[PDB]
Amino acid sequence: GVEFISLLAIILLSVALAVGLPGNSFVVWSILKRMQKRSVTALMVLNLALADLAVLLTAPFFLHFLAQGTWSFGLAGCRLCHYVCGVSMYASVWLITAMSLDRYLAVARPFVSQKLRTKAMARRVLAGIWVLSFLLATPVLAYRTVVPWKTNMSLCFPRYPSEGHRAFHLIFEAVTGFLLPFLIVVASYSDIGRRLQARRAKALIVYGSTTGNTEYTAETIARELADAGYEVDSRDAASVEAGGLFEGFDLVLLGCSTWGDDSIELQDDFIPLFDSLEETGAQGRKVACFGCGDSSWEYFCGAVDAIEEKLKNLGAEIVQDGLRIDGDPRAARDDIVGWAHDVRGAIRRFRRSRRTGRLVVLIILTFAAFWLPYHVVNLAEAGRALAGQAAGLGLVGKRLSLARNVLIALAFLSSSVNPVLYAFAGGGLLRSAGVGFVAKLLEGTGAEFLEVLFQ
Ligand SMILES: CC(C)(C)S(=O)(=O)NC(=O)c1ccc(F)cc1-c1ccc2c(c1)OC[C@H](Cc1ccccn1)[C@H]2O
Ligand SMILES: Cc1cc2nc3c(=O)[nH]c(=O)nc-3n(C[C@H](O)[C@H](O)[C@H](O)COP(=O)(O)O)c2cc1C
Ligand SMILES: CCCCCCCC/C=C\CCCCCCCC(=O)OC[C@H](O)CO
Ligand code: NA
Numbered sequence: 001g002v003e004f005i006s007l008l009a010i011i012l013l014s015v016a017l018a019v020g021l022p023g024n025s026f027v028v029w030s031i032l033k034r035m036q037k038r039s040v041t042a043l044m045v046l047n048l049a050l051a052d053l054a055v056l057l058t059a060p061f062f063l064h065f066l067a068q069g070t071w072s073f074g075l076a077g078c079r080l081c082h083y084v085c086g087v088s089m090y091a092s093v094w095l096i097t098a099m100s101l102d103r104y105l106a107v108a109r110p111f112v113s114q115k116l117r118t119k120a121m122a123r124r125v126l127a128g129i130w131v132l133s134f135l136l137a138t139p140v141l142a143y144r145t146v147v148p149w150k151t152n153m154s155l156c157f158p159r160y161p162s163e164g165h166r167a168f169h170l171i172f173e174a175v176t177g178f179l180l181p182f183l184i185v186v187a188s189y190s191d192i193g194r195r196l197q198a199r200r201a202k203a204l205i206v207y208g209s210t211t212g213n214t215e216y217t218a219e220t221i222a223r224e225l226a227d228a229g230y231e232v233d234s235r236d237a238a239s240v241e242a243g244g245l246f247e248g249f250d251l252v253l254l255g256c257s258t259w260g261d262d263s264i265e266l267q268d269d270f271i272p273l274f275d276s277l278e279e280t281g282a283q284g285r286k287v288a289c290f291g292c293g294d295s296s297w298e299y300f301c302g303a304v305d306a307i308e309e310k311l312k313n314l315g316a317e318i319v320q321d322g323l324r325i326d327g328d329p330r331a332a333r334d335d336i337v338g339w340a341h342d343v344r345g346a347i348r349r350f351r352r353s354r355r356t357g358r359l360v361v362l363i364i365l366t367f368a369a370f371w372l373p374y375h376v377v378n379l380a381e382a383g384r385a386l387a388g389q390a391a392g393l394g395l396v397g398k399r400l401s402l403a404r405n406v407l408i409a410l411a412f413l414s415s416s417v418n419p420v421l422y423a424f425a426g427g428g429l430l431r432s433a434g435v436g437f438v439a440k441l442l443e444g445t446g447a448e449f450l451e452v453l454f455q
Contacts, residue, residue, distance in 0.1 A: 023419030086137030208270025238269035264302030283315035290323035370414035
C-alpha cells in the first residue's frame with residue numbers, strides 16, 4: 001500500500017539515523033579531535049562525512065512528517081531541510097568524483113600528483129566543491145512550499161510553475177548531480193583499469209616424439225603453463241609447417257629426442273621443421289628447448305643441443321637451459337613441471353601494483369547503487385512530463401511516482417554506508433593481515449592509518 005511504502009520509509013530513515021549519525025560523527029571527531037595533522041585524504045574523508053552528517057540531521061524532521069502526517073516546521077523549515085539535502089547530494093557526488101580524479105592523476109602523471117596533492121590544493125577544491133554544491137541546489141529553495149491539503153494536513157510538496165520547470169529541474173538534478181560527475185568517474189577508472197589490463201599469454205609447444213616420452217613432457221609442461229593462465233598450443237611436429245609457425249606466440253617451447261645410431265640424429269617428425277627452422281620467425285622470440293634421451297649414449301640429448309644452437313644462431317632469445325630428461329619422463333615429473341615454472345618466471349610480465357583502491361571503488365559503487373535508480377526515475381518522470389505531462393499518476397507513472405518515494409528513503413540510507421565501509425574494509429583486511437601491524441600505524445597521530453585504508 002501507499003502507507004506500507006511509508007512504513008519502509010520510516011524504518012529506512014530511522015536505521016540510517018541509527019547507523020549514520022554515530023558513524024559519520026565518530027569519523028568527524030577522530031579527524032578534528034584525534035588527528036592533529038589533517039592530511040589530504042583525511043580532509044576528503046571529513047567533508048564526505050560532513051555532507052553525510054548534514055542530511056541525517058534533517059531525517060528526524062522527515063520522521064515527524066511521516067509520523068503525524070503533516071508538516072509543522074513552517075515554510076522556512078520545509079525550504080531549509082530540502083536545501084541541505086540537495087547540497088549533500090551534489091557535494092557527495094563531486095567529492096567522490098574528486099577522489100577518482102586524484103587517483104587517475106596519481107597513476108597517469110605521478111610527478112603532477114606529487115606536485116598538486118597538497119593540503120592547500122585540497123582546501124581549495126574542497127571549498128570549491130562546497131561553493132559549487134550550494135549554488136547548484138538553490139532551485140529547491142524556490143520549488144518547495146507547504147500547501148495545506150485535506151483537513152489539518154500540510155505537505156512539504158514540490159510545487160513548480162509548470163511541468164517544463166519540473167522537467168528542467170529533474171534533468172538538471174540528474175545531469176549535474178550524477179550523470180556528468182559519474183561520467184568523469186567511469187572514464188577515470190576505465191583508464192586506470194585499461195592500464196593494468198594485459199592480454200592472456202600465448203605459448204607454443206611443438207614436440208617430436210617416436211615412443212611418446214617427449215609427448216608426455218610436452219603435455220605436462222602444457223598443463224603447467226595452462227594452470228598459470230596461458231593459452232597453450234600443443235602440436236606434433238609431423239603436422240606443422242615452418243612458414244610463420246611461431247608468429248603470434250610470446251613463448252615457444254621446442255621438444256625433440258635424439259635418435260642417432262652412431263650419431264646425434266633428430267626425431268623423425270622433427271627433422272623437416274629443423275631444416276626449415278629459419279622460416280618460423282624465431283628471431284627475437286622467447287624460446288626454451290626440452291627433450292628426452294638416455295645418459296647411456298655418448299651425447300645426452302644431443303637433439304636439444306642442436307636445436308638450441310640453431311635457435312641461438314637464428315636470433316632467438318633462449319630463456320632457459322634445455323630440459324634434458326633421462327629415461328622414463330614420468331619418473332622425473334617434478335623436474336618437468338618445475339622447469340616449466342622457471343620458464344614462466346623467465347618471461348613473466350612485471351608484477352602489477354598490489355595496491356588497488358578497493359575502498360574508494362566501494363564508496364563509489366555504493367553511492368551509485370542508491371543514486372543511479374533515484375536519478376533514472378527523475379529522468380523517467382521528466383520524459384513523461386516533457387510530453388505526456390503526467391505527474392504523481394499515470395499507468396507506469398503510478399509505479400514511477402511510488403518508486404521515487406522509496407528511493408528517497410534509500411537516499412538517506414546512502415548517507416550511512418560510507419562510515420560502515422570505512423570500518424568494513426579496515427577491520428576486514430588490516431586486522432586479517434596483522435593485528436600488530438595495525439597498532440603501529442594507530443600509535444602515531446593517525447594519518448598513516450587512513451592512508452593505508454585507502455591503499
Ligand atoms: C514528490 C514527493 C511526494 C516524493 S515529495 O518530494 O513531496 N517527498 C518529500 O518531500 C519527502 C517526504 C517524506 C520524507 F520522509 C522525505 C521526503 C524528502 C526528503 C528529502 C528530499 C526529498 C524528499 O526529495 C528530493 C531530495 C532527495 C534526497 C537528497 C539527498 C538526501 C536524501 N534525499 C531531498 O530534498
Ligand atoms: C635407435 C636409437 C638411437 C638413439 N640415439 C640416442 C642418442 O644418440 N643420444 C641420446 O641421448 N639418446 C638416444 N636414444 C634414446 C632416445 O632418445 C630415448 O629412448 C628417448 O626416450 C626417445 O624419446 P621419444 O622417442 O619419446 O621422443 C636413441 C634411441 C634409439 C632407439
Ligand atoms: C555542471 C556544474 C558542475 C561543473 C563540473 C566541473 C567541475 C570541475 C571539474 C574538474 C575541473 C578540473 C579538471 C582538470 C583537473 C586536472 C588538472 C591537471 O591535470 O593539472 C595539470 C596542471 O596543468 C599541472 O600543473
Ligand atoms: Na551523501
